[PDB]
Amino acid sequence: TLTQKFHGLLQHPLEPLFLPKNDGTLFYDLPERFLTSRYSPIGQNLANRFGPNSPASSQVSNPPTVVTIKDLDELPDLTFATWIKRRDSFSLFNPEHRKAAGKLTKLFLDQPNADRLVDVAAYARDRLNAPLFQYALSVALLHRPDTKSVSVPSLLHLFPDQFIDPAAQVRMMEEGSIVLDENRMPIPIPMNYTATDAEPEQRMAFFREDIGVNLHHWHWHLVYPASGPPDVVRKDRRGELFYYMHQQLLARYQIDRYAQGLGRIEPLANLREPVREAYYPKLLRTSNNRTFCPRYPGMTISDVARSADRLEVRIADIESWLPRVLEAIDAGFAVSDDGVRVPLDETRGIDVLGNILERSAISINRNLYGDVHNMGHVLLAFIHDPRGTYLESSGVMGGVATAMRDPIFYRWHKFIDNIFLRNKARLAPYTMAELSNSNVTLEALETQLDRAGGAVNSFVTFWQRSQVDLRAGIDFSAAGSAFVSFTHLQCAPFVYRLRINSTARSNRQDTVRIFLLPRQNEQGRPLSFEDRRLLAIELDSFRVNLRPGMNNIVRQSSNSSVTIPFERTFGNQSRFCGCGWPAHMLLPKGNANGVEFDLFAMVSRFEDDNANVNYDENAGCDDSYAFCGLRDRVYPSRRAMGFPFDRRASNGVRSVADFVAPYKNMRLATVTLRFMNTIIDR
Amino acid sequence: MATLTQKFHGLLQHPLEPLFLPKNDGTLFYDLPERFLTSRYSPIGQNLANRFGPNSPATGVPPTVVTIKDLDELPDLTFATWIKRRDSFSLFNPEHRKAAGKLTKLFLDQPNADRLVDVAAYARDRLNAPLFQYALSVALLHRPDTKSVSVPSLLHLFPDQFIDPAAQVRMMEEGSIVLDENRMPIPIPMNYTATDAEPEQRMAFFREDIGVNLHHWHWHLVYPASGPPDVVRKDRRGELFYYMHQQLLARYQIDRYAQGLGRIEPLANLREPVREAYYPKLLRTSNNRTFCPRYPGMTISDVARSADRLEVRIADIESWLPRVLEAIDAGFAVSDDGVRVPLDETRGIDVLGNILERSAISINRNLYGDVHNMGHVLLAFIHDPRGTYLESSGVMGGVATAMRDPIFYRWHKFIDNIFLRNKARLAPYTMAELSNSNVTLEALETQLDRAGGAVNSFVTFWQRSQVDLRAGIDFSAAGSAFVSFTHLQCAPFVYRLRINSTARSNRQDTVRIFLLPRQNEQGRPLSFEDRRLLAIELDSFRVNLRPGMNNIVRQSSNSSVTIPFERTFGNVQSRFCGCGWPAHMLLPKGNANGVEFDLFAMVSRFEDDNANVNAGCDDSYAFCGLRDRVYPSRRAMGFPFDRRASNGVRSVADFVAPYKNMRLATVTLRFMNTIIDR
Ligand SMILES: [Cu+2]
Ligand SMILES: [Cu+2]
Ligand SMILES: [Cu+2]
Ligand SMILES: [Cu+2]
């Protein structure tokens, strides 16, 4: 298969191609000059010891597959990426690193066919920075028409050192070296891993340091990058999706802070004040053994000038870019670099602001509005060595797949979020036309645990212990499995029971929108309505064919358009499938006393909802629309993401009851979320 | 005793590789009783024997099998098991020292050497690796029936305490892919912890030198602060503690001046922010917990880490220091029995040494506390004082790593200034003590050891050396694991001394050689007091002076201060042999412009110079003394510069003018910025 030929490249990054891939089953016949300077002199010896005919290759079929690599008519220019050494640290928040990624990605997309891509990718692999190569090749495989159905491995199986406690990984080296795969045991990773309960922020470790959550963040930015070739970047409403996905992250994050006795997120607005929160990642780059350096308590952010990284940005740069962005928001319009005024007070205004604020390549004015969000990561990621004097690499905030582990990630994004919200606050409240559905009434809203005698309007969360083989990302290891054991949040399966009456004569492809709204803060005091609204988290959105008369609709929690199955996250199928909220993180954790939520359901009108896209949510990879949208297609809800809660409500509205009182297509259900402090195996 | 080294060698290598795995690259094997295997591997004991036994599919020689006898009863190891097998280990942690002591005691308490092997084999795979290797090392050095058992240096046990992990991980690729016959040394750079933008980086050749750090570790191994009584109580260890570090600081200071850096700022104020930063890069292979860096301007916090059973406050040092200062100022200290112990003597510095470190033989643990050691603690856990963030010690919490940190020299200068407060009270040496009326030193000279060799001219440069770290790297490929590193090196030379004796019979007098600096970093001349405090010992040795004129030639390689390259970086010769300043660091680096020193030589009288004690391991007494013997010089260590001179002395010339048994030679030290292979 074509997937087979690429698979060998997309694994064991620092293990060269002349070494057998896929547990000594997949081999590569390389032109001599494909081997790098070091290994070329012993090329024949390498073939004898690690070839398809080697004395090690004899007993593997107790098969084998050989991939033939054609020589290139001319060797491609890789000078653009050569300044980044094969084992150097790599940061996607480094503009010069993104630039190197873009050109390599472009080089891959520009190949005449898929088979010549294999050749060029095979040549570049061992001559190139592993994170850089793996990223570009991944992006190219997701966008080339002739590789549409090529399965690509998750980052978990490429660079496990960005997700796993290195203490666990090194303990695994002993288990593999000594014990046969037949007898091996998973090395367990603890919950108290970056801090003890003495640190209040550790309460959110189930969220921040969740492997699934970080994989989602990485995959989202993979699908929707800020740079690269134009067609790779330009995707439907990526600017708006940038705001929304992170807005929902913060909302879910905040809700559980309230549930764990933690207060409201303090926005990181003052970059010259000391950074209160500390964080010690412990994560370690296997390639150079350079850590994701920790941030000690109360450090002050410095101007970053790191010539070795070709990286440079001052605090004042952000302090100069932000008033211009705020003024544009307050003026109701932005100005492109050609001087055409672009309105912001629209439904699509949040999307222009998204590309401006991140920023992305399709921003309408790079110079005026700068690069606020991205450079904020840079300043924080190199706070421990801003000038490169001490030869350290980025902290977790300088890694897309690791940034969510740092408490400061949510403080910084809350600042970014409040900028988007400054724009959303200007929008007029949704009208009678937009909110009502006069032929459709929602008569019954319910949740029931998917079992016999299942409790009604009752959510239950607990600890699940799962296993995963990290075999593919561990270089120069033993053979066989490299299982690890980790513990994470998990909720009990349930269904939505909706009874919907339609007095219309014909069928309506209406959309059902389900949200969860919190009631109290950490004090146990009720939140203002606006606070409840801003903390509304999407649980599900789906179309239903309401026949006239009575409809009884039952919706499986497992079919959430927000989440993806465990196997989509941790398994070994493009990387779009890797994008999506982890299923086991569908509901907030809550506590053992019980947290009461307002379950909200709405039946909106297909007339306002459709953008003419056809997808089967139970087919392919189209079941993670909420955060990821659809692959190579437009976002199937014409409504603003977050509808109907992305806008401020009318005057005199003070409850979720008030908000839904005038509309019979809406209904609330009081649901209780309770956490059970026990570990259940998968 | 040769085969006895074999049985211990397998224990003294690949620490986290259990004993059922073939040692010495599949040459040395161990036949273990089934209950010697730990809980995890016991159920698969038979499979492990099939795959890793002497007859498994794993030179020309039949392998060696060591048969381990079962124990009459299993020993209680619970005292040390709270320190997990892969946990971090710090000898500045009193509780860890306590655990080390008891394990050493269990080892010393064994009836014979062979029975020690049995107990050591049992404890090995059940115990914290740094802890086990240390205890076993110490015990093998003190047991009479193991007195000539060779023990590997820490370089071949835990290379991750000496080597940039970036280099080590690169080495992992080279071993896995390339046959041993074709392998290449992985080069380690000198600039790796900081760039030239950090002024302190100029001293990286000193602080981060592998040889220099190995010396520090071996010295403390030979002269520990804790453990069984016979292991601690050694001749003038307290004074040697002061002198060895006083000389470290002096040499360190001399090169700062040479690199444009100022004088060492004492770490006297523990509550003001610590200016100097340091990023070790070093990594513990066992748990992948770094020797955490110290960012610029951090403030020291009270340390309370229940997981480490470790707790010490800044206020404790602020309470211990006045008590020590009052004793020095009183001229006497007070033991825990209320017996007054004089300090205004030649041996007072030795009492003060045990008080300040402190050691187990301190005369009053409660009153004077534990200043020097706890200072290490406060600094080593500055990044996680309460253990909230589950991090381990920085480099200051590792004996073999502490010297890499710039703050080590600031802290020790503080300690040094307390010792010097006592040394300043002592009366200046008299004519009787300093003169030698039957002996005249007429000519002092150094010549580079070659044909046409330059005279009174020192030359330093970079040497590129290799060392096989094979033995300390667990679960790696087989065969060599060579590395390439660069370090200071000086050109070989000789001392030419012409000595006339008007005595009628022979005298076995002593020649004492010191190097004294002249200028600071500005280029301004040092006061005599500054020159005296920076006097560094280069050599001290006896000489047989026949009546009349004697012509003495002394090889620089025969320095009583240093030890050969092979003693530092070699492998299987006890661990006393590991103690000793590195030969290649005999002279300061200097600069490329040239630095002028006053080479000082003295011929003191054997009548004062003799305690009643150089082809074995007795060539490093200056810092290490002699193994199982007394310090071969009766004079205070540093003589004649450990005491301030007469009131009328204002130059180095004045100090030596009244004594004809002394002579100065002006010597130039010049650095050559070039790398020469070994
Ligand atoms: Cu993001
Ligand atoms: Cu971000
Ligand atoms: Cu020391
Ligand atoms: Cu010390």
Residue numbers in the entry:
A (entry chain B): 3 to 64, 69 to 578, 588 to 697
B (entry chain A): 1 to 58, 66 to 579, 588 to 628, 633 to 697
Q: What did the study's authors say about this model?
A:
Herein, we report the crystal structure of AgPPO8 at 2.6 Å resolution, representing the first structure from a recombinant PPO and the first from a mosquito species. The crystal structure of AgPPO8 contains two identical subunits, each comprising 700 residues, which are associated tightly to form a homodimer in the asymmetric unit. C592-C636 is situated on the surface and exposed to the solvent, while C594-C643 is located at the interface of domains II and III, which may contribute to the structural stability. The overall structure of AgPPO8 homodimer closely resembles that of MsPPO heterodimer, with a 1.14 Å root-mean-square deviation over 1,129 aligned Cα atoms. Each metal ion is coordinated with the NE2 atoms of three histidine residues, which are highly conserved in this protein family: CuA is associated with H223, H227 and H252, while CuB is associated with H379, H383 and H419. All six histidine residues are located in the α-helix bundle from domain II, and stabilized by three Phe residues (F99, F248 and F415) through hydrophobic interactions: F99 with H379 and H383, F248 with H227, H252 and H379, and F415 with H223, H252, H383 and H419. The distance between the two copper atoms is 4.5 Å, which is the typical distance for the reduced form of type III di-copper proteins. The UV/Vis absorption spectrum did not exhibit any apparent characteristic feature from 250 to 700 nm, supporting that the AgPPO8 structure we obtained was in the deoxy state. As seen in other arthropod PPOs and hemocyanins, AgPPO8 also contains a putative ‘placeholder’ for phenolic substrates, which is F99 in each subunit. Interestingly, the analysis of the AgPPO8 structure revealed a prominent cavity in the di-copper reaction center, which is close (~1.5 Å) to the solvent-accessible surface.
